């Protein structure tokens, strides 16, 4: 009924790589994890869905394999892991979304986070499916139905509460670069009876972030202040040398874990490396797991 899992995000490889070099990259993933101690301890791969056109991103954005094609490669090179993914619902329409969700579950995915994109319907005829409506409508197809939880966002208490009422089973956080989630989940536990599973998301920040700024872009929220603080922490990690970067990161992790695991929500972990998996990323994830892991 709960995942109680550690999930590693693997973004699908570029469409132009071809099969032979897709599996080589996945083979490197297996070696990096074994070398880092992770190889028994990651139960799920989270494969995010697709943005086709660019959103302003600081990186280049090439066309990717569909979630289904990439998942079959993943199963070849990482036969231990189970599958989670992300699905945009806003563009599909109920019948199409039913077929898509059925195909995902049929091909071995155990949980799906329903993601929404705002769109114009003043024109832009044809309703898609709002993520919160999908949560109710497809509960017979998807046992683990997720939403994005952004604990720094204005009105997230009302927003996440609504999604829980509408049938959300877990919340997957935006990348966490402060302990805002601690106060959010405590206030959420005081104002409501919803106890969804929380997928806590931690992202490795490489020095390259000082030059490219991808993670700063991923978490931006104009005029927030809590996010402003998080962006300063990202820059500081990027400008920190490995020992201090690891310690600052793991101190953040320890505060979140300590502040959260007794609130009464089931807790799972979600590890991202937005610039691509790497030995320093996997070492950071191994350090976090040595402090605390589900089970």
TrEMBL record:
Entry superkingdom: Bacteria
Q: Output the Gene Ontology terms for molecular function.
A: nucleotide binding
Name of the molecule in the record? Methylenetetrahydrofolate reductase
Q: What keywords does the record list, in alphabetical order?
A: Nucleotide-binding
Q: What species is given as this protein's source?
A: Mycolicibacterium smegmatis (strain ATCC 700084 / mc(2)155) (Mycobacterium smegmatis)
Q: Does the keyword Nucleotide-binding apply?
A: yes
* Record InterPro entries: MTHFR (IPR049477)
Q: Which Gene3D superfamilies match?
A: 3.20.20.220
* Annotated binding of NADH, by residue: 116-117, 119, 121, 123, 153, 163
